[PDB]
Amino acid sequence: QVVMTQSPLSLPVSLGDQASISCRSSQSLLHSNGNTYLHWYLQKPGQSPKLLIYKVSNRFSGVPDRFSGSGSGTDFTLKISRVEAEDLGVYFCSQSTHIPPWTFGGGTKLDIKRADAAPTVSIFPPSSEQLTSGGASVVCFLNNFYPKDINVKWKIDGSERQNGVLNSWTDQDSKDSTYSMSSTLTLTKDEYERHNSYTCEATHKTSTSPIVKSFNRNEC
Amino acid sequence: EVQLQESGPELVKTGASVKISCKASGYSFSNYYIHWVKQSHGKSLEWIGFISCYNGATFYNQKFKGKATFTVDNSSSTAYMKFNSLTFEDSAVYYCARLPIQFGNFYPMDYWGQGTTVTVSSAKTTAPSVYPLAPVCGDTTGSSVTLGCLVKGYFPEPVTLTWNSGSLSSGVHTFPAVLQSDLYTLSSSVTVTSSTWPSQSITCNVAHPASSTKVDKKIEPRGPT
């Protein structure tokens, strides 16, 4: 089994610039017949993967000359000149020199570069309706930030709380190129109503200080 | 004009089997292999095996021997993969891809199907609990306000969530569902100007077809107690 390793998993690039995606194989892809069978694909969400480059550098049918491939042995690069919005998606390499099995890299997703943006953070106590049901979820939205990396920390009565937290992240927004995140801390109503303060803290490269949103069950 | 059209999404119980199809068009079907490839969410493609559309010969990745069976119906230009003894770990998107016979054995898989999602679970149909998320009680001092809707504890996917029956589409973030203890949870936020809410009603509308449920939750300002 030839292992294909791709970097980076996420690649920011501004439109009009060249993007470079790398692939490394665990074993040389030079066949004894002199050819090197390293190929590149593009997958957009919910669409068929499309063959872009085959045999290191040969463009497949209909693929524009903005796409080129290079490399030898174990190290390969896909270059996309003048990146456009229709180029956005996941690019992945594959080898067919040592088969079976056919093996694939883990993919690199293009990210559009934009101006940094701090998240807009909002915290939500449990609804009266959920509390009547016997449960308690506290929700924190961290919306419209860039770049994509972010950390959320929950605290109950000032103490960090990791158990009971579920997170979800949106894909990059097509309008404004920002990212958003939702974090939910779920406790029993019994445990929720034993404590007073609930806090969601967002850490993002836009500030050395976290953005803190909190409430107290005791008073508005 | 090459196309590989795969069959639709499947929801299957633990231990059962499913058979998915890959219909080819726009080329000489019998001059190609059809390969099958697995894509677990957020993982590298994993090759399963191939079948020759020329003579029906098969070869399986040992990890899937006993699990997957390939067939072809030459007359309908259709390849099939059957999966038995399905487990949670079989939940993935499965692709078919063609590989020519005539340009050497090392030629790439050159055209792919769009994928078939297979979800495997022992869970029973369960309608969501839908909770409106009004802001913390107090005074919205900002120019805008963010509201939420929490859709907790349902099975299977999908749900549909709208705000004001679709009339409120801007400033919405509906988050991918997360699966915990066999059930899904999803949330959505909507951000409007503070002169919009609470003076105008904002309602989250949630439909879960599998339980045939349809819920509206108006977002109400929280009281001071």
**CATH number of the domain bearing residue A4:** 2.60.40.10
Q: Residues in chain A, how many?
A: 220
The reply to whether A43 and A129 lie within a common domain is no
Which residues are registered as beta bridge partners of B5?
A: B23
Ramachandran class of A177: left when φ > 0, alpha when ψ lies in -120 to 50, beta otherwise: left
Kindly give the residue spans of alpha helices, DSSP state H, lying in chain B: none
In a domain, A220, yes or no: no
The alpha-carbon gap from A19 to the nearest alpha carbon of chain B, in Å, equals 21
The reply to whether A37 and A121 lie within a common domain is no
Q: Quick check: bond before B224 cis, omega within 30?
A: no
Structure determination technique employed: X-ray
The reply to whether A31 and A91 lie within a common domain is yes
Dihedral over Cα of B195, B199, B201, B202: its sign = positive
DSSP B87-103: -GGG-EEEEEEEEESTT
Q: Are B219 and B197 in contact (CB under 8 A)?
A: yes
* Resolution in units of Å: 1.6
Q: Indicate yes or no: CB of B173 within 8 angstroms of CB of A143.
A: yes
Q: Residues of B with CB below 8 A from A124's CB?
A: 133-136, 148
- State phi, psi for B47 to the nearest 5 degrees: -70, 135
The alpha-carbon gap from A214 to the nearest alpha carbon of chain B, in Å, equals 9
The reply to whether A61 and A140 lie within a common domain is no
Q: Residues of A with CB below 8 A from B113's CB?
A: 48
Q: Is B185 near chain A, with CB under 8 Å?
A: yes
Q: Are B139 and B224 in contact (CB under 8 A)?
A: no
Torsion angle of alpha carbons A82, A84, A87, A92, nearest 10°?
Answer: 40
The reply to whether A128 and A87 lie within a common domain is no
Q: Residues in chain B, how many?
A: 225
Q: Residues of A with CB below 8 A from B152's CB?
A: 130, 135, 137
Please tell me the total count of domains within chain A: 2
Gap between the Cα atoms of A13 and A111, Å rounded: 6
Q: Which of B77, B94, B79 is nearest to B34 (CA)?
A: B79
The reply to whether A7 and A83 lie within a common domain is yes
Count of C-beta atoms within a 10 Å radius of residue B106: 21
Q: Which of A83, A98, A114 is the last residue of a domain?
A: A114
CATH topology for B1-122?
Answer: Immunoglobulin-like (2.60.40)
The reply to whether A132 and A172 lie within a common domain is yes
The reply to whether A126 and A210 lie within a common domain is yes
Please state the separation of Cα A199 from the chain's center in Å: 25
Which residue's structure tokens are 């067939």? B71
The reply to whether A110 and A137 lie within a common domain is no
The reply to whether A3 and A34 lie within a common domain is yes
Torsion angle of alpha carbons A141, A143, A149, A152, nearest 10°?
Answer: -20
Q: Indicate yes or no: CB of A125 within 8 angstroms of CB of B136.
A: yes
3-state secondary structure of A218: coil
Gap between the Cα atoms of B204 and B57, Å rounded: 54
Q: Are B49 and B70 in contact (CB under 8 A)?
A: yes
Burial code (b: 16+ CB inside 10 Å, e: under 16) for B29-66 equals: beebbbbbbbbeeeebbbbbbbbbbeeeeeebbeebee
CATH topology for B123-221?
Answer: Immunoglobulin-like (2.60.40)
Gap between the Cα atoms of A48 and B98, Å rounded: 12
How many helices (H) and strands (E) would you count in chain A?
Answer: 2, 19
Q: Which of residues 161-180 of B touch A (CB under 8 A)?
A: 173, 175-178, 180
Q: Quick check: bond before B100 cis, omega within 30?
A: no
Which residue's structure tokens are 């030079």? A30
Burial degree of B172 (CB within 10 A; 0-12, 13-18, 19+)? middle
Burial degree of B107 (CB within 10 A; 0-12, 13-18, 19+)? middle
Gap between the Cα atoms of B128 and B117, Å rounded: 22
In a domain, A15, yes or no: yes
The alpha-carbon gap from B113 to the nearest alpha carbon of chain A, in Å, equals 5
Residue-range definition of the domain harbouring residue A14? 1-114
H or E, element range at A178: none
Gap between the Cα atoms of B82 and B71, Å rounded: 8
In a domain, A44, yes or no: yes
Q: Indicate yes or no: CB of A107 within 8 angstroms of CB of B114.
A: no
Q: Which of A157, A154, A164 is nearest to A212 (CA)?
A: A154
Gap between the Cα atoms of A86 and A95, Å rounded: 25
In a domain, A170, yes or no: yes
Q: Which of A86, A114, A142 is the last residue of a domain?
A: A114
Q: Are B36 and B96 in contact (CB under 8 A)?
A: yes
The alpha-carbon gap from B51 to the nearest alpha carbon of chain A, in Å, equals 13
Q: Are B91 and B42 in contact (CB under 8 A)?
A: no
CA dist B26 to A82, B3, B23, B29, B194, Å? 32, 6, 11, 8, 56
Which residue's structure tokens are 């119906």? B73
CA dist A71 to A4, A57, A68, Å? 14, 8, 11
Which residue's structure tokens are 């913390």? B136
CA dist A90 to A147, B87, B156, B175, B177, Å? 18, 27, 27, 20, 21
Give the strand pairing for A10-13 and A108-112.
parallel
Q: How many Cα neighbours within 13 Å face the side chain of B94? A: 28
As annotated, the residues of chain B forming the CATH 2.60.40.10 domain(s) are 1-122, 123-221
Torsion angle of alpha carbons B137, B141, B144, B148, nearest 10°?
Answer: -10
Gap between the Cα atoms of B143 and B135, Å rounded: 14
The reply to whether A158 and A201 lie within a common domain is yes
In a domain, A204, yes or no: yes
Which residue's structure tokens are 């802001």? B135
The reply to whether A138 and A74 lie within a common domain is no
Gap between the Cα atoms of B142 and A169, Å rounded: 25
